[model samples]
Target: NLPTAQEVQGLMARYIELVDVGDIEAIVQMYADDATVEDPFGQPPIHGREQIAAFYRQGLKVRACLTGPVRASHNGCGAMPFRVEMVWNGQPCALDVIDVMRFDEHGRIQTMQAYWSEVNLSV
Candidate 1:
């Protein structure tokens, strides 16, 4: 069964909420076993559950919040804009990113691509 737009949107919010709290495990659960992550949309894709977990561990931080509404299509995809507040060794900054996620019939995310650049970064 294809995921309804509502389910996709709800998953998007839950994904953001997990990231906001730095719940990497829960966030990872949202992805399927063969899920792929292409952060920034152009970087090398990180594949599978193991790699996905490692990807989230290195720089995970809390304090992210939605900057706009979550939009989902009839097909099993969703997108949203959010800003993440980060502190790297006492340097504080914020990053604005938009992510597009495609889900499976089971409601597990199959692919995620984040769209952002240094242009959206602020100190």
Candidate 2:
């Protein structure tokens, strides 16, 4: 059965908390072994847990915070618009992003896609 809307919301909250803490290992564990990530849409998908871990390890070096309420459904999917504030090459910056995640029956992420553009990034 699909997760309830409340459950999906909880899952998204946990995800945001984990990312905020920079817990890359725990964050990667939220996905299935074969899960895929397509950050920014047109990029090539990163497949499997290990590869995904590497990708997040690089990205999670920054501090992340959810900017508003998580929009989630009972069909095991959620969307979070958030900001990651940090230093990039010795300069302070932030990225505004909308992350869409699809969950499997077991509540693990089956796919995650992030939406953002370089031009909208704040410095």
Candidate 3:
């Protein structure tokens, strides 16, 4: 099940969908083995699927509402990088996420490093 650029994009879309719909189960399943998230404005770097899920759970409190749009653009036939502008509780800021993902021969993610900026929502 070698994932294509489109498949990767679909995964990205699911991320946005889960946040908006508050689908914890579906969102947690999307994480890779060593997945880590950096959203300092919310939580620290969350490692592994379980920690990520817990982070999302806490997020459901501070950000009672979540919504975003993902825009992806593929380059040179490889996976596309995307910028997702998400609004939480009516504040606006964009997450600069660059997902460098490698898939195993069986199409499962072998390694993935998502580089992004932590929101500095200071008044």
Candidate 4:
């Protein structure tokens, strides 16, 4: 039940859409019940569904207009790098973010870890 590259792309796109539109529930569905998300730096890993949803919820309120176009290739940590157009202070800013993901046999995302730059906060 390994996920095809296209399937992985679909999963990633769905996540980007949900996050961009602030659809917390849809993003939650993309993960396993016990999925974990760690975004940049050494932040404590967000464990389980509720925590993950809360993480997105908190961020979504402050940042509403976030659009990400991901290009995934190969496997493992360095496989996928996404270009994002995010709204900050009411202006669009570009970011190149990478997510290292591992999927389960059923094509479900088991773990998703993101790495992005914090230096360029320009809009």
Candidate 5:
């Protein structure tokens, strides 16, 4: 209803907040029925809401703090860099991830790509 930039930022921030809330159901609810998520990039993308639920359910129960301001183009797309602080193998770690999300005109996520790798993690 307002500026596209503000909506994009709000949506990105909500994603982070919900993940920290760790409600798998809530996470999938925001995605479009046919949304695709490619976490960590190279992995095959998970298609649709059912697969998206399974995908997010496996991990992502960590705090996401934005490393900087969210960025976006004039169109319905945005990117945000954030750090996921969590534990792995009983050891604490921090993973810096950049997520780029595309929203359809309906204001639902169309494609979500999470950019991160071994290089982005700190133990």
Candidate 6:
């Protein structure tokens, strides 16, 4: 059976907590071996735990925070709206994003997609 809404919500809460602490390895471990990730929606997807870990390691250069609660469904899918604050080119900035995640039967993430844009970045 697929996870319930509350289960996915708890998963996302823990995930956001992990990201905020730069726990990329733990986050990558939450994904299935063949999971895929796509940030910014239209970007090329990264496949496999190794590649996903690399992508998250790069993202770990900054700090992330979940701005609000997770919106989730019982069908093993959820979305989290968050913010990433960091210094870019010597200037401090923050970006807003909405991340959608789908889980597999084992409750591991199967796919993740993030939605954001340049305008969402604030200085």
lDDT of 3 at 42: 32
What's the number of clashes in each of the models?
0, 0, 0, 0, 0, 0
What C-alpha lDDT, on a 0 to 100 scale, does residue 97 get in candidate 6? 94
Point out where model 6 deviates above 4 Å: none
lDDT of 2 by residue, 3-52 (tens): 67888888888998999898889999999999999998889999999999
**Candidate 3 similarity to native, TM-score:** 0.52
Error of 3 at 43 (Å): 8.7
- Compared with the true structure, all predictions reach lDDT values of 0.90, 0.89, 0.53, 0.68, 0.87, 0.90
lDDT of 1 by residue, 1-123 (tens): 668998887889988889888998998898999999999799999999999999999768458998999999999988999999998668899999999999998989999999999999987
Best by TM-score: 1
Top-down TM-score ranking: 1, 2, 6, 5, 4, 3
Question: Hey, what RMSD does candidate 4 come out at?
Answer: 3.7
Which regions of candidate 2 fall more than 4 Å away from where they truly are?
none
Question: Please, what are the lDDT tens digits per residue for candidate 6 over residues 3-109?
Answer: 68999998888888899888888999999999999987898999999999999888786778889999998799999899989998899999999999999898899
Show pairs that collide, candidate 4. none
In angstroms, give how far residue 110 of model 2 lies from its true place.
0.4
Model 4 C-alpha lDDT per residue in residues 36-109, reported as the tens digit of each score: 88886367798889998898777763232224444555452223655556667677777666777777777667
Winner on lDDT (2 vs 5): 2
lDDT of 5 by residue, 57-111 (tens): 8885477788898997668899999989998889999999999999888778889
Q: What is the lDDT of candidate 6?
A: 0.90
In candidate 1, stretches whose alpha carbon ends up further than 4 angstroms from where it belongs are: none
The alpha-carbon deviation from the true structure for residue 39 of candidate 1, after best TM-score superposition, in angstroms, is 0.5
